[PDB]
Paper text:
Mutations in CK1δ/ε (hereafter referred to jointly as CK1), as well as [name], exert powerful control over circadian period, altering the intrinsic timing of circadian rhythms by hours in vivo. [name] is regulated by a CK1-dependent phosphoswitch, where kinase activity at two antagonistic sites functionally interact to control [name] stability. We discovered a conformational switch in the activation loop of CK1 that regulates its activity on two regulatory regions in [name] that control its stability and circadian timing in mammals.
To test the role of Site 2 anion binding in regulation of CK1 activity, we made charge reversion mutants at positions R127 and K154, as well as at K171 located nearby on the activation loop, and measured enzymatic efficiency (kcat/Km) on FASP and Degron peptides in vitro. Strikingly, these mutants all increased activity towards the Degron, with a ~ 50% gain in efficiency for R127E. To further examine the role of K171 in regulation of anion binding, we solved a structure of the [name] mutant crystallized in high sulfate conditions and found a full complement of three anions bound, demonstrating that local flexibility in the activation loop allows it to retain sulfate binding at Site 2 to some degree. Overall, these data suggest that anion binding at Site 2 correlates with substrate selectivity on the FASP and Degron peptides. Notably, the change in selectivity with Site 2 mutants in vitro makes them much more tau-like, consistent with a recent report that both tau and charge reversion mutants at Site 2 lead to decreased [name] stability in cells.
Author numbering: 2 to 217, 222 to 293
């Protein structure tokens, strides 16, 4: 009877993340299903324990899943996590690659806040993308959660807020489709880069696709050439100027700058209200 420590029965694979696979679990002790992350202990650079400490620093924030680091069982490090609902990439597909402007702005408000909270606890996420935001369950079905801290990194000192130095970091960490221009140029990531990636995620929702998507490491330069050759004003054309304004404000932030989260939220909130929408948490998937 294959269980993690007498408590959660292990089920089928339900996803991949950074640095391991995710499996379904059943808490016979409570009554809920859980997600179970497993990492093969045979590596010189194990990551699961580290990732679960970041989760522990983020507990109590809105939209942060609760986890439980259960240590090593033979060949695997185990971390039990709150099972949430579908990812935004999943919901985008239910909705046939179309989100209403209201839904995008409903998401923008929450995704900006999630990123702000992470930054408040001194980490940058480094892989902002639609698969790493999931809707909650039940009474939390209106709530956007952020997940996967396996590429996350401390960007400032916890007691003195000394920001990490500006330096060339030459590993592309994260998905290339949403990577900031600073990352394509080999610069260490900071808070500005999480938000620029959110800017691309938003326009991806609006367009259904990005101009650097289906491009035939050669492909990684192809994306970066195309991403830099494509001015912001062309990428966001035929959509409210606020998306262009968002993206320009992210690219113009200084490396160590504390982003103005209220400003970005207010761009979208004011456009939201001018269209007459109400923050009622009725997304496109709430009308089937």
């Amino acid at each position: 009877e294959l269980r993690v420590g007498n408590r959660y029965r292990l089920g089928r694979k339900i996803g991949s993340g950074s640095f391991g696979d995710i499996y379904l679990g059943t808490d016979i002790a409570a009554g809920e299903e859980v997600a179970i992350k497993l990492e093969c202990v045979k590596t010189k650079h194990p990551q699961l324990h580290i990732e679960s400490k970041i989760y522990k620093m983020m507990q109590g924030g809105v939209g942060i899943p609760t986890i439980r680091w259960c240590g090593a069982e033979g060949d695997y490090n185990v971390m039990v996590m709150e099972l949430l609902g579908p990812s935004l990439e999943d919901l985008f597909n239910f909705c046939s690659r179309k989100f209403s402007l209201k839904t995008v702005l409903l998401l923008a408000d929450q995704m900006i806040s999630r990123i702000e909270y992470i930054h408040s606890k001194n980490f940058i996420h480094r892989d902002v993308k639609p698969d790493n935001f999931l809707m909650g369950l039940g009474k939390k079905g209106n709530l956007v959660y952020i997940i996967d801290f396996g590429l996350a990194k401390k960007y400032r000192d916890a007691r003195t807020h000394q920001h990490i130095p500006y330096r060339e970091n030459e590993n592309l960490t994260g998905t290339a489709r949403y990577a900031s221009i600073n990352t394509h140029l080999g610069i260490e990531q900071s808070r500005r880069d999480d938000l620029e990636s959110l800017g691309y995620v938003l326009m991806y929702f609006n367009l259904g696709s990005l101009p650097w998507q289906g491009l035939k490491r050669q492909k990684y330069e192809r994306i970066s050439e195309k991403k830099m050759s494509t001015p912001i004003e062309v990428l966001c054309k035929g959509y409210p100027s606020e998306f262009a304004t968002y993206l320009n404000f992210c690219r113009s932030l200084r490396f160590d700058d504390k982003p103005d989260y209220s400003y970005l939220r207010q761009l979208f909130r004011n456009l939201f209200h001018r269209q007459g929408f109400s923050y009622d948490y009725v997304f496109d998937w709430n009308m089937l």
